[PDB]
Design a protein around this ligand. Structure first.
Ligand code: CO
Ligand code: CO
Lengths: 288, 288
């Protein structure tokens, strides 16, 4: 804790913790955006996806079940970090409100994903396999540990940690979000694609907020440091979608998927105030 | 941290943090109740209370402004405790979900109260006086410090702390909630009484959950310890409504108000599994 007192975002200068005397309208506006986007899992009708999961092909279910499992855990990893870290560190009221809402929405996301799994896998045995993917699946573990490491890293500053999770919510979900949107295009799994639209939207907002926090940070990682955290996330995600769980299992081109991950990484870099790293176009017309 | 490993609620046995494999339906049900009660401040129309605040009498505005100020802070005190303590300690998924939602609703409550103040006090000078009541007002400080002390108490167990905050959200708000319902009966301040109905309801739910957590606690304070925490809260609250801010300022009988505080304290004791302390009837027919 060196020059932390000079951080408007972290400095212990509240001695207020009131609300309306809003100091940061940009942060508050983000929070209001999130509030108005509130939804509950009960709002997604799954009373019809059981049949769709049947018409599906063996390779497809394999891909989906694995993607869902990866989601059933990730949402939790993010949530823990927000609870025992970010929401603790940040002393700015507006930010605390946004983080408080993000937490609630992440739990709704968790519930949504568990609800999906239960609907498709009625066998309580396979259910446990997917629910404990963090330990039952090595592929999902490489990513789980990556994010988990940023939670227990007592050295990494808030600046590095905020970029790492922006990468988790942005790069680690990008491939899966794109895979689901692809299915929607193919007219498959209405329940899965509908919830995916609400979730992807929330993650996009959570990512934009992360970048906004980064900007309110005075002493933050150097550009090179940011490029490597983001780049490590891109490689991890690409390997996951081209080796561990090839998008070919659902009729997607591995190469195009690789390009999309780089595209998403570049947008994140721009939102953080830096230049692009890969300089590639968005290969998917249904993701713009 | 003696025998904490034997606490199902606190023991670090998650290694799951998934959701649907619900273990405690009673806790989950509480969370679902809270979720369905969601509301935003934007849902309360205040485009008419400015006139009502005028027709009000000098003593009445004095009472209200002071009650609101007490609220603008309390909601924050509770929130901080939930963020840097309860939500941290509890490892049970269902409980974490409820606490995550409580936090979000408390911030909406804060916003609602600040919105009310701004509407009634257009003078930014008096605004600051009420917003920083924790330091600008001694009366509200005695209560603020009481709750604040339970946050920084590194000795008090979760059991004691959970009872203390159940007392804050139940006993410390009781008098003020009753005062507002009294105004509603007198047909005054529609904006204030409407929001009061949504808030009081949420606090009641937050109190019931506190009692439910207490029950899931194996090693908790002895009944005598519970009676004194609750009793200290009753005396503090009574003094506040009969000396610091006499309910007489709004046409209420000090004695009856004293009896209501004791009534509320007794209900809390019953919800915790103990016998009543005061054994008094609810003196207000508009509070049943
Ligand atoms: Co998120
Ligand atoms: Co509350």
């Amino acid at each position: 804790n060196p020059s932390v007192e000079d951080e408007p975002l972290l400095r212990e200068n509240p001695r207020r913790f009131v609300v309306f005397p809003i100091e940061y309208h940009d942060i508050w506006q983000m929070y209001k955006k999130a509030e108005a986007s509130f939804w509950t899992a009960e709002e997604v009708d799954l009373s019809k996806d059981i049949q769709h999961w049947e018409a599906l092909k063996p390779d497809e279910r394999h891909f989906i079940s694995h993607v869902l499992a990866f989601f059933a855990a990730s949402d939790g990893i993010v949530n823990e970090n927000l609870v025992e870290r970010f929401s603790q560190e940040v002393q700015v009221t507006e930010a605390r409100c946004f983080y408080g809402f993000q937490i609630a929405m992440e739990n709704i996301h968790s519930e949504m994903y568990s609800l999906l799994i239960d609907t498709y896998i009625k066998d309580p045995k396979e259910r446990e396999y997917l629910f404990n993917a963090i330990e039952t699946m090595p592929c999902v573990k490489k990513k789980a540990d990556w994010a988990l490491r940023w939670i227990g890293d007592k050295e990494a500053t808030y600046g590095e940690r905020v970029v790492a999770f922006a990468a988790v919510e942005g790069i680690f979900f990008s491939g899966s979000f794109a895979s689901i949107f692809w299915l929607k295009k193919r007219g498959l799994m209405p329940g899965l694609t509908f919830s995916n639209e609400l979730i992807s939207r929330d993650e996009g907002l959570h990512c934009d907020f992360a970048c906004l926090m980064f900007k309110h940070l005075v002493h933050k990682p150097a550009e090179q440091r940011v490029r490597e955290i983001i780049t490590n996330a891109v490689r991890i995600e690409q390997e996951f979608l081209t080796e561990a769980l090839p998008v070919k299992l659902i009729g997607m081109n591995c190469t195009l998927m690789k390009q999309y991950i780089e595209f998403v990484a570049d947008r994140l870099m721009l939102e953080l105030g830096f230049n692009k790293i890969f300089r590639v176009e968005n290969p998917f017309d249904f993701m713009e």
